[PDB]
Design a protein around this ligand. Structure first.
Ligand SMILES: CO[C@H]1O[C@H](CO[C@H]2O[C@H](CO)[C@@H](O)[C@H](O)[C@@H]2O)[C@@H](O)[C@H](S[C@H]2O[C@H](CO)[C@@H](O)[C@H](O)[C@@H]2O)[C@@H]1O
Ligand SMILES: *[C@@H]1O[C@H](CO)[C@@H](O)[C@H](O)[C@H]1NC(C)=O
Ligand SMILES: [Zn+2]
Length: 1015
């Protein structure tokens, strides 16, 4: 295994280093507004050394943005694809590339067989080429790597089945900045080349000057280079035709033949295209070849990529003709005039890359190595696209919830083969496709119109119901005596109970377990653990009595805590925000112990008085002017006091101190240790009243944030043996700190209400001497070092926080893990901050055509880990990566992949069993089974199950936490007959494994295995 900590890679371009050196001046470059006037030596090309030009027609099709997926399909995309089929069929030299398989699948299944055959033939002959082949062209900032892989797999599995092709070149012209997670996944999925576009204009200029726009993109920790993927960065401001022929858009626009008027389009530079004729083809060719040779100056080979397309292009037959016939006339002239020394043709993306690598192998170029990312994007001036790290945070959180239930549904159902009547594959396919769709760069990003957001939400809600169905059917099968099992595949044997989605205060969706002497004495509940190690975790349920005790299915008592059900109300009569307690339902909490990838059953039983093994939390309401809080049968009376500082400790865990406003002020890790200052604060950013306005994409604050005025908020303290909390009703946020004996959990119920032109930020203030350094993750996969740059504006120092962030000095680290992607930064030494929501009245001129005025309450979740790190083996000061500790990693897992909870729906479960998976290996803590997916339907004689295994890298800090069992996924199901290593999509076998054993993977590596079973 390569060491991902101690060896700093030697790369030609390291993006953090480049950032430190670059001046980012925004000067007028001339016709290339963000560049310079390019010059070329005309004698560079000659008869023995020609410029080879590939014009690559394309059409950018958003799977929802300003219209829904289905609306765009009906209005635009079905016509684009129908006319592509006809036009390519009839014009054999014409070419076209296609990226978004969601749309292509939607189209193809509506074709008659004759047209399906015609379509297969233009793909097989290379006229129509799929690029990337994902379901969508995903966002790269907010998306989790697991869902990037999911959508990639969804599209490529479709393409292999129906088109018999697997793309090896990726096309990502539209995400708002770019992540190294993409080449990581793509390189492990058979890819050889990728293309990107939306990078900071200053980066484009810098790399163009050095001819470093094509590079071997490796991971930041990769000393050897085995992760490298050849990458092409386009050089100009847009992917449209004016910005793809060359540096002068006034000239390039004249070669977009849809802009002569009858299509309703024109050239903003005020010179229209003219139809090519024999009288003008020489002059027109001179202009165009000059543009091409200038673009070629920015690259190292004599092979040039010229994209030819724009959003929802190639719709009308007349548009196909006007582009094709004019370009054909240009190519005939240019290629026959030896003095240009050019050979130009329509091509595909793979044709371009193949020709580049032929030039490379001929010794005509050597490419630089690069590591780093391409965040935060700015397309012009100070317009940094850090707003979309937060926009529409409800749906960002929903993404993470659905991510987990897709994993859990696929895993739980994979253990068996299912009859088709069970509709398992149907429901899983729907769930995967709806989550996959949402990875679009207008989905999870929060950059779509209101009604489109609603469509994505409705789709995801259906997907969650599909996962629930599959999960609960699977639990019933896994835990019922086989000779008793009698399934009705439409029935709900269990319902899922989720304490954090949509959340208390967002939706009252949880079911109470109703027990009573005259109705039902007890209830079975089941926990699932998707992670491949034993886990203990507190779980809670709502119950109709406080006098409830818990047993395991050996009837062993389990210690439990009962607490009230508190809900917060904005009392419009008193103009305060305060909690009310239920008088008929209560929360019971207990520790569930669940096998690796397994299930555990418990029983809740009512009694007529306090049970021996159940304790009751105390409750203290801090506010002036209190009024009573009755709690029905709950046996401890609420206590009241004036606001005051208070401290809490659960178990032998940290002691937390809180201000009189209910906000953390310090953490004491152990009995004698210092009370370390760690202060939460809520602040507000506003919007500029002159110049450019913040919107869904852009964050353009009117200076540093101002503190939220808190008034005298009401504080609720619950103190229990198993779980304690401090909750406070602040303006726009019910803020909660929860303690269970380790790192606290933070929950924010965020309701920005009608606060227009406001962004609410949560900041942590410490004494940690972090300087200008902080760490943020990329797609939940890796942590990258950030350096705050005072030469850039505030919004430029905001980065995606898809799963966590930290600051550290020599001795102390503070890590904030998130259950949802949000934007954040460290704007001063010792600080962390993360945006909660944003409400914006203006459009920000990027095409959305609305503000963000559709906010809804969202429950954001976090873990806060303060640690001593002086004994940890960390990377050197020059290394661009950072790594989590064990405790921080486990805290992230507790947010993203919690135990699932199931409540048996009927009164009696006949044949119930206590556990599943007790013989599953308990793997080392850094290893995960990211995906378990049965790949075959029940009719297949040889069943196949796919696994994706990911090993992270945790710091060595002198805490072994060892003896663990080897995990061989190929022996998790019986009767294995073959085990193969595959690409991450499962679509190509890479190694036949001896002994049918799937080895574990190296730190920071991800591998896929497929086991086959005879059984
Ligand atoms: C404001 O319209 C202009 O920009 C939008 C940009 O849409 C892309 O980028 C946004 C972010 O800015 C992203 O959210 C979205 O997914 C898209 O990737 C363009 O849609 C239009 S193209 C439009 O008008 C062109 C000029 O007339 C025409 O050539 C094209 O075919 C379309 O009709 C525009 O550039
Ligand atoms: C799929 O593509 C490959 C390569 O051209 C070819 O061998 C095979 O005949 C095609 N059709 C299949 C495998 O069904
Ligand atoms: Zn787009």
């Amino acid at each position: 295994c390569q060491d991902v900590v101690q060896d700093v890679p030697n790369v030609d371009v390291q993006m953090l280093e480049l950032y430190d050196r670059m001046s980012f001046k925004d000067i007028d470059g001339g016709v290339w507004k963000q560049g310079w006037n390019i010059k070329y030596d005309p004698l560079k090309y000659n008869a023995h050394h020609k410029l080879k030009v590939f014009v690559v027609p394309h059409s950018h099709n958003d799977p929802g943005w300003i219209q829904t997926f289905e609306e765009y399909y009906q209005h635009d995309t079905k016509h684009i694809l129908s006319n592509a089929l006809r036009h390519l069929h009839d014009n054999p030299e014409m070419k076209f590339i296609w990226a978004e398989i969601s749309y292509f699948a939607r189209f193809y299944h509506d074709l008659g067989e004759n047209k399906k055959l015609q379509m297969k033939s233009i793909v097989k002959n290379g006229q129509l080429e799929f690029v990337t082949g994902g379901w969508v062209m995903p966002d790269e900032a907010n998306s989790h790597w697991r869902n990037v892989l999911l959508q990639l797999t969804e599209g490529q599995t479709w393409l292999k089945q129906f088109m018999n092709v697997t793309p090896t070149a990726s096309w990502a012209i539209a995400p708002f900045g770019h992540s190294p997670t993409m080449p990581y996944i793509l390189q492990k999925s058979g890819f050889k080349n990728m293309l990107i576009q939306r990078t900071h204009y200053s980066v484009k200029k810098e790399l163009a000057q050095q001819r470093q726009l094509e590079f071997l993109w490796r991971q930041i920790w990769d000393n050897k280079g085995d992760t490298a993927l050849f990458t092409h960065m386009m050089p100009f401001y847009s992917y449209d035709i004016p910005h793809t022929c060359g540096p002068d858009p006034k000239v390039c626009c004249q070669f977009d033949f849809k802009r002569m008027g009858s299509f309703g389009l024109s050239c903003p530079w005020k010179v229209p295209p003219r139809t090519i004729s024999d009288q003008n083809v020489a002059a027109r060719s001179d202009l165009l070849v000059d543009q091409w040779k200038k673009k070629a100056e920015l690259y190292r080979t004599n092979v040039l990529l010229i994209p030819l397309g724009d959003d929802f292009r190639f719709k009308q037959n007349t548009e196909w003709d006007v582009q094709r016939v004019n370009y054909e006339r240009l190519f005939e002239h240019i290629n026959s005039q030896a003095h240009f020394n050019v050979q130009a043709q329509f091509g595909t993306l793979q044709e371009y890359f193949d020709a580049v690598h032929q030039a490379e192998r001929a010794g005509q170029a050597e490419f630089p190595t690069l590591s780093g990312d391409f965040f935060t994007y700015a397309d012009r001036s100070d317009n940094y696209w850090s707003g979309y790290y937060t926009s529409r945070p409800y749906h960002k959180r929903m993404d993470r919830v659905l991510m987990h239930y897709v994993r859990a549904a696929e895993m739980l159902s994979a253990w068996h083969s299912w009859d088709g009547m069970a509709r398992i594959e149907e429901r899983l396919e729907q769930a995967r496709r709806e989550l996959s769709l949402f990875q679009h760069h207008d989905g999870i990003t929060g950059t779509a119109k209101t009604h489109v957001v609603v469509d994505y939400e409705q789709r995801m809600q259906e997907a969650l119901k599909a996962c629930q169905m599959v999960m609960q059917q699977s639990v019933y099968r896994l835990l019922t005596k086989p000779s008793i099992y009698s399934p009705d595949f439409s029935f709900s044997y269990f319902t899922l109970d989720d304490s954090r989605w949509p959340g208390s205060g967002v939706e009252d969706s949880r079911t109470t377990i109703i027990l009573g002497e005259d109705i039902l004495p007890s209830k079975h509940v089941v926990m699932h653990n998707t992670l491949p190690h034993w886990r203990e975790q507190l779980v809670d349920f709502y119950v109709s009595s406080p006098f409830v005790s818990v047993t395991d299915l050996a009837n062993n008592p389990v210690e439990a805590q009962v607490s009230p059900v508190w809900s917060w109300h904005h009392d419009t009569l008193t103009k305060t925000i305060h909690p009310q307690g239920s008088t008929t339902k209560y929360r019971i909490i207990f520790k569930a112990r669940v096998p690796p990838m397994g299930l555990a059953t418990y029983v809740l039983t009512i009694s007529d008085s306090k049970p021996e093994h159940t304790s009751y939390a105390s409750n203290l309401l801090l506010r002036k002017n209190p009024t009573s809080l009755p709690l029905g049968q709950y046996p401890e009376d609420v206590k009241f006091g004036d606001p005051r500082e208070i401290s809490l400790r659960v178990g032998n865990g940290p002691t937390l101190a809180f201000s009189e406003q209910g906000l953390l002020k310090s953490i004491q890790l152990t009995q004698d240790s210092p009370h370390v200052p760690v202060h939460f604060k809520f602040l507000k950013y506003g919007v500029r009243s002159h110049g450019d306005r913040s919107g869904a994409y852009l964050f353009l604050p009117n200076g540093p944030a101002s503190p939220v005025e808190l008034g005298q908020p009401v504080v609720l303290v619950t103190k229990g043996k198993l779980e304690s909390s401090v909750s406070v009703g602040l303006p726009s946020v019910v803020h909660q700190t929860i303690m269970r004996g380790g790192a606290p959990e933070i929950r924010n119920l965020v309701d920005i209400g009608s606060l227009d032109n406001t962004e609410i930020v949560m900041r942590l203030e410490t004494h940690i001497d972090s300087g200008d350094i902080f760490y943020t993750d990329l797609n939940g996969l890796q942590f990258i070092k950030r350096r705050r740059l005072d030469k850039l504006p505030l919004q430029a120092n905001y980065y995606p926080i898809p799963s966590g962030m930290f600051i550290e000095d020599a001795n102390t680290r503070l890590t904030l893990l998130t259950g949802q992607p949000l934007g954040g930064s460290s704007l001063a030494s010792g600080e962390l901050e993360i945006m909660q929501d944003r409400r914006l009245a203006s459009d920000d001129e990027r095409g959305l055509g609305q503000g963000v005025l559709d906010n809804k309450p969202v429950l954001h979740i976090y873990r806060l880990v303060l640690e001593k790190v002086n004994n940890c083996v960390r990377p050197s000061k020059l290394h661009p990566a950072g790594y989590l500790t064990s405790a921080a990693h486990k805290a992230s897992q507790s947010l993203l992949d919690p135990l699932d909870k199931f409540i048996f729906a009927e009164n009696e479960w006949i044949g119930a069993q206590g556990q599943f998976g007790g013989d599953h290996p308990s793997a080392r803590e850094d290893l995960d089974v990211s995906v378990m997916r049965r790949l075959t339907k029940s009719s297949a004689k040889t069943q196949r199950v796919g696994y994706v295994l990911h090993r992270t890298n945790l710091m060595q800090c002198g805490t072994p936490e060892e003896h663990t069992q080897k995990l061989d996924v190929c022996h998790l199901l019986p009767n294995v007959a073959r085990c193969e290593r595959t690409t991450l999509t499962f679509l190509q076998n890479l190694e036949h494994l001896d002994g049918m054993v799937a080895p574990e993977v190296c730190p920071m590596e991800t591998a896929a295995y497929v086991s086959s079973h005879s059984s």
